[PDB]
Amino acid sequence: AIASELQAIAPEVAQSLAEFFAVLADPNRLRLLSLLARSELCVGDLAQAIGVSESAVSHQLRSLRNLRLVSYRKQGRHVYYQLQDHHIVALYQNALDHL
Amino acid sequence: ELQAIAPEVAQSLAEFFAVLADPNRLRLLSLLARSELCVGDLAQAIGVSESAVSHQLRSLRNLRLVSYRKQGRHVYYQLQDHHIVALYQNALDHLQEC
Secondary structure, three states: OOHHHOOOOOHHHHHHHHHHHHHHOOHHHHHHHHHHOOOOEOHHHHHHHHOOOHHHHHHHHHHHHHOOOEEEEEEOOEEEEEEOOHHHHHHHHHHHHHO | OOOOOOHHHHHHHHHHHHHHOOHHHHHHHHHHOOOOEEHHHHHHHHOOOHHHHHHHHHHHHHOOOEEEEEEOOEEEEEEOOHHHHHHHHHHHHHOOOO
């Protein structure tokens, strides 16, 4: 009934959103995000959980940091990574559940 | 005590996000996220022919991103499930500020 009052997202917004989803179209990134969706973790824990070197994980996390998919905090001699925000958690979980 | 998602699951999820990385598809989903709509409504909304939108919807139906229902003498399309609605809204919100 409200068809006449609806308009699609702007083209530039659709492009920006498409780019966001393209960044997530990476199984390796998703494996890392699946762990962070359940607990804040250091690179050491992430590396052992997946089965790769910490250097490998560190490299993958740099891209994720730059793309604002993950963030980190420092406490003592540890650096804990986590998902950027609750929106990332929600979209990840909803996508997984849809599948 | 933590295990990542299975390799096959990560791959399937990656493919799912890959099909969403399409501006034209997202424009259509952005409309359906607000309300179910007939092909006529969608075509006029984005400014293309009904045939064009019908073609695009064909792909979205097979990709399980949209579904449809018969309401009287018309067919209305909708997002496949609420998860699509929620992931779409959360992604857009993320790309925004407060």
